[PDB]
Amino acid sequence: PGDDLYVKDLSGCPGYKATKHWQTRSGFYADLTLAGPACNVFGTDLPDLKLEVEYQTSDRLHVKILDTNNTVYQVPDSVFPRPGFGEWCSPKDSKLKFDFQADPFSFTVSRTDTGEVLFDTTGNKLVFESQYVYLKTHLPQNPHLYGLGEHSDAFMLNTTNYTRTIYTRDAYGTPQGENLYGAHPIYFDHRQTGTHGVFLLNSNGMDIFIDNNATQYLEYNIIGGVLDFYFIAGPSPRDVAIQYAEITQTPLMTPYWGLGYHQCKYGYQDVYEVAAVVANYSTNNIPLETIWTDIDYMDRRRIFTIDPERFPANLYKDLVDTIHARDQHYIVMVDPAVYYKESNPALDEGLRYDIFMKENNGSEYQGVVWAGPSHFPDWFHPDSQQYWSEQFLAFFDGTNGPDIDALWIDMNEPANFYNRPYPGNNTTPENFAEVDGDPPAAPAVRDGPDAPIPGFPASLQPNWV
Amino acid sequence: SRRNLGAGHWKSPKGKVDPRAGWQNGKQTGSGCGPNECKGLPNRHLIRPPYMIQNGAGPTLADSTADTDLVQSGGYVQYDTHNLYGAMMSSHSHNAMRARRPDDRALVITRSTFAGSGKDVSHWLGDNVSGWLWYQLSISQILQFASLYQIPVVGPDVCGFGGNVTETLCARWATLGSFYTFFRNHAEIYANPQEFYRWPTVAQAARNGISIRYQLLDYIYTAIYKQNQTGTPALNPLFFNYPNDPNTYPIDLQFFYGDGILVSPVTEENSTSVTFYLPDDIFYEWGTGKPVRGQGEYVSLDNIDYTDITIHYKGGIVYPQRIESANTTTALRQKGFNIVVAPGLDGRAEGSLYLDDGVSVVQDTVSEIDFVYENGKLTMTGSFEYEAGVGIETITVLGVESKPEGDEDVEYDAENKKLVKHVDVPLTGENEITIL
Ligand SMILES: *[C@@H]1O[C@H](CO)[C@@H](O[C@@H]2O[C@H](CO)[C@@H](O[C@@H]3O[C@H](CO)[C@@H](O)[C@H](O)[C@@H]3O)[C@H](O)[C@H]2NC(C)=O)[C@H](O)[C@H]1NC(C)=O
Ligand SMILES: *[C@@H]1O[C@H](CO)[C@@H](O[C@@H]2O[C@H](CO)[C@@H](O)[C@H](O)[C@H]2NC(C)=O)[C@H](O)[C@H]1NC(C)=O
Ligand SMILES: OC[C@H]1O[C@H](O[C@H]2O[C@H](CO)[C@@H](O)[C@H](O)[C@H]2O)[C@H](O)[C@@H](O)[C@@H]1O
Ligand SMILES: OC[C@H]1O[C@H](O[C@H]2O[C@H](CO)[C@@H](O)[C@H](O)[C@H]2O)[C@H](O)[C@@H](O)[C@@H]1O
Ligand SMILES: *[C@@H]1O[C@H](CO)[C@@H](O)[C@H](O)[C@H]1NC(C)=O
Ligand SMILES: *[C@@H]1O[C@H](CO)[C@@H](O)[C@H](O)[C@H]1NC(C)=O
Ligand SMILES: *[C@@H]1O[C@H](CO)[C@@H](O)[C@H](O)[C@H]1NC(C)=O
Ligand SMILES: *[C@@H]1O[C@H](CO)[C@@H](O)[C@H](O)[C@H]1NC(C)=O
Ligand SMILES: *[C@@H]1O[C@H](CO)[C@@H](O)[C@H](O)[C@H]1NC(C)=O
Ligand SMILES: *[C@@H]1O[C@H](CO)[C@@H](O)[C@H](O)[C@H]1NC(C)=O
Ligand SMILES: *[C@@H]1O[C@H](CO)[C@@H](O)[C@H](O)[C@H]1NC(C)=O
Ligand SMILES: OC[C@H]1O[C@H](O)[C@H](O)[C@@H](O)[C@@H]1O
Ligand code: NA
């Protein structure tokens, strides 16, 4: 990767200055221009920017720094519907107050009641480039920061020489001090005087660095997009949570049975092992609500298929019927990788709807995951939803596949073994698959379970009946 | 039908939505971006950019994922929307699950997410390892999702995905696992079997943990509903409950299951002792209900059996519990209620109980029940539209210093300062019950 974060020199970057500024009933606005010659340290310095400050509610302040002609990437409205429709707040009626210096350009977010500074870029360069956006805030000595995951570090973030990298990746062992599967650019700032929240609505890769070199600070190193901030005032920890839920939208409600205990394993080789696990829980008087199956159910790890030897439709139906008859539930794994080397419903319908991510030359993008050489759906394609829905409707019907009660989604980063390293280990998809073992040989077909399964049909223990 | 009868009591204030004000940005979208706008600048290095992030996967943005130069429908490039691929698959899968069962809430446990994914999908913390470190950091991670990221249903692989788990670590994980909003044992293909029945100690540790969990299932179901309603979190760091106590600020080896249940697991490998912080408040031991006065100081318990976990009730809260656990949640819903009153320092207690059909996305009938206890009296207000076919069988009041005069339908445990009052109160309408 390198050490760009640690050895970067921004001393030659000129920052910005506000050429003109106007106020509205619930807003502050300013045109920003380079205060000097471009540094172009990590791409091309944008000559001109817009500052947009919306007091949306008394709780939520929107501070947005973007380009002037709406070309820089912004998170689609599709994916993250924005808050503040029909909402506006007179500045003096807001818990948070926005202040700015014109030259050099910096801004402060403060508490309207106490005057306490929550976020302060005073004395720190704004750098806004094609492929690099840098903003740095002062913080109090020994601050208490939470979030900016998904991470596996201390809940209260390290404050000295702490790198926090947000970029979704398949990170086996969920390693500490490394970017993991999810991306949540929200931090809670907890103080004796109250709690507040700082949300960056940016889906680009970024290195956040928290350190106390001279004074305490937090900096964003973002490789694209705009500085799209929501400040939320709390002042209680729950208030910040509630206010952040106004932005994300409140979470969907869960089924009651879902709170029951779930059993899964990667390696459950056939319908016989799944049955035996369920019965062994009941025999040993340990409650079990839901039994799962990983990639083992599939035909040679191909999505929307069943192993016709180890998960044959008839015995798969008998398994799911007995699970349901005992008032238990069944969940199985699905992944985005669609095998393209042989015909299968997901590939065939995939090509027909034409919903696969494509190369410049227009041919479908090639990777390798568990089935072998694979394509990846384009979720932006306007037929991607119908393709996906119809796949589910055709497969999880209790005939072609199991009538599941809930879904497990894995390797949706997306995971692509082929790029180990990029590009494609300097070989073809077919050769990488063979060497890497995608798919591996399933274990030898069994006559049935290794012991009788009390409470399950004869069909799931033919070697014991 | 979809009447949603008796709902809306716990929603937060809907801010003044002046419709003709529209967006302040003056545009037709919240982004201020038209449908052919904000797609990204051209002439960019999309595989290996000029500033490269500390990517653990490798030297490019493409290592162990999809090439970051790929142009998607609408002109979006993977460089920009990569962090949303997890979220957008998850969204598409949710809708697909809804297509095949349109009336049911779709439960989706997904790996990769982005901010806002809470609104349509739940999370598991991916491929951890059967080690004490992954058990330790699990609490940092559930708090991240439930408390910060608005994804309240979250858990790791209980007893660890990779490696071979020991009897002791799995017994420990089984008890801690019982206080995750998502509770799931999962393991790697070359890992030895680690179902709870494989070890007697792990099996009994599970029986203990699942029993407590299932007693509190409606309690956590209510917390997740309130989060669904207002965004108030179903798991709370200690500082969420004690914001003015700096000792709680860095604590990530304890958490609140809902608002009131303090989970203080044994964290140290091959140990039966735990050092844990009790805030300056009244607490009550789980099961016994024995008062424990926290002093805003660390306390040390020794001889914590590998089948056991230290759990306290926070004072000032009413805990609605199923009188018993059961082998299925279908059986659990047929058990009566034990309303456990844990008075605060002011002798008062507050708590809610949400009841519905447990499955439907838009309920026909709901019971949004509020409980208030003060001056020996339990008041039950709210809505009661859901036919539960079960009522309150016991009202337990904790911190009763002395046995009361009358001995009508009341047991007093003098050792544990606990009163139990036998009753038969249906959840069909508001009610008042005198205990003391
Ligand atoms: C609690 O969870 C429920 C679902 O379990 C959430 O339901 C969500 O409700 C909203 C609005 O009713 C749905 O959004 C959309 O509204 C537009 C109206 O302009 C409509 O045309 C769309 O078809 C859609 O209904 C949203 O889809 C739905 N979510 C799910 C997963 O079904 C609810 O918002 C949560 N919060 C509360 C306070 O209930
Ligand atoms: C379920 O439990 C049974 C015991 O009730 C296990 O059966 C034993 O399996 C081993 C081999 O793994 C045999 O050597 C024993 O003879 C079996 N015992 C009996 C009494 O039949 C079975 O393996 C367990 N299965 C699962 C999936 O946990
Ligand atoms: O090489 C990536 C990882 O592959 C395996 O794990 C993946 O596949 C399993 C079966 O589908 C899933 O259970 C798991 O969640 C996936 O990440 C392998 O077991 C890991 O060790 C690899 O790192
Ligand atoms: O095994 C059934 C019982 O499980 C719980 O109780 C056990 O686990 C607790 C937590 O470690 C211990 O405090 C207690 O001593 C154990 O017996 C549950 O609380 C009981 O209601 C169940 O009967
Ligand atoms: C938009 O502005 C950028 C600088 O941020 C410039 O490179 C580009 O050519 C402009 N395009 C139009 C159509 O004005
Ligand atoms: C910062 O911490 C990392 C490990 O987290 C360490 O490798 C490095 O030496 C530290 N940097 C400095 C400048 O001390
Ligand atoms: C956070 O600080 C702790 C304690 O000094 C240290 O063990 C850990 O390496 C730090 N983490 C990172 C990612 O720097
Ligand atoms: C649960 O216990 C009941 C009552 O003994 C029994 O009818 C049922 O089959 C059991 N189910 C499971 C999954 O243990
Ligand atoms: C299309 O371009 C990709 C990217 O270099 C290449 O791997 C593939 O072989 C090309 N296919 C055709 C048919 O030209
Ligand atoms: C990757 O390439 C190297 C040669 O550069 C080879 O030794 C290795 O076996 C390859 N592995 C796969 C899975 O392609
Ligand atoms: C677990 O131990 C067994 C032997 O008991 C061994 O065959 C296996 O390789 C080990 N698995 C892992 C993941 O270390
Ligand atoms: O095909 C499977 C589906 O069939 C029916 O549509 C049922 O309503 C649904 O519960 C089931 O999952
Ligand atoms: Na394991």
Count of individual beta strands of chain A: 23
Bound molecules: a molecule of 3 linked components (NAG-NAG-BMA), a molecule of 2 linked components (NAG-NAG), a molecule of 2 linked components (GLC-GLC), 2-acetamido-2-deoxy-beta-D-glucopyranose, alpha-D-glucopyranose, sodium ion
- SSE pattern of chain A: HEEEEEEEEEEEEEEEEHEHEHEEHEEHEH
Q: Count the strands of chain B? A: 22
Q: Tell me the strand order in the biggest sheet of chain A.
A: 1-2-3-4-16-13-12-10
CATH architecture of the largest domain in chain A: Sandwich
Shape of chain A: elongated
In whole angstroms, how far apart are the ends of chain B?
43 Å
Strand fraction of chain B equals 15-25%
- Secondary structure tally, helices of chain A: 7
The value of Rg of chain A in angstroms is 27 Å
Percentage of residues in helical conformation of chain B? 10-25%
Strand order of the largest sheet of chain B: 6-7-8-13-10-11
- Dominant shape of chain B: globular
Order of helices and strands of chain B: HEEHEEHEHHEHEEEEEEEEHEEEEEEEE
Largest sheet of chain A: 8 strands, antiparallel
Domain module count of chain A: 2
| CATH architecture heading of the domain at 314-434 in chain B | Sandwich
- Beta-strand residue percentage of chain A: 25-35%
CATH homologous superfamily caption of the largest domain in chain A: glycosyl hydrolase (family 31)
Care to describe what's here?
The complex is a heterodimer of chains A (465) and B (436). With 465 residues, chain A is of the alpha+beta class. Chain A has two domains: 4-248, Immunoglobulin-like (Sandwich), CATH 2.60.40.1760; 256-464, Glycosidases (TIM Barrel). Chain A is 15% helix and 27% strand. In chain A, the strands form five sheets. In chain A, strands 1-2-3-4-16-13-12-10 form an eight-stranded antiparallel sheet, with helices on one face. Chain A has a five-stranded antiparallel sheet with strand order 8-9-15-14-11, with no helix packed on it. In chain A, strands 17-18-19-23 form a four-stranded parallel sheet, covered by helices on one side. In chain A, helix 3 packs parallel to helix 4. In chain B, 20% of the residues lie in helices and 23% in strands. Chain B has seven helices and 22 strands. A six-stranded antiparallel sheet of chain B has the order 6-7-8-13-10-11. Chain B has a five-stranded mixed sheet with strand order 14-15-19-21-20. Chain B starts with 77 loop residues before the first helix and ends with a strand. Chain B has a domain at 314-434: Golgi alpha-mannosidase II (Immunoglobulin-like). Chain B is globular, with a radius of gyration of 24 Å. Chains A and B meet through strand 11, strand 12, strand 13, helix 2 and strand 17 of A and helix 1, strand 1, helix 2, strand 5 and helix 4 of B. The structure holds a molecule of 3 linked components (NAG-NAG-BMA), a molecule of 2 linked components (NAG-NAG), a molecule of 2 linked components (GLC-GLC) (2 copies), 2-acetamido-2-deoxy-beta-D-glucopyranose (7 copies), alpha-D-glucopyranose and sodium ion. One 2-acetamido-2-deoxy-beta-D-glucopyranose (NAG) binds at residues 163-164, 188, 190-192 of chain B. It is classed as hydrolase. Keywords: GH31, alpha-glucosidase, transglucosylation, hydrolase. The assembly is dimeric.
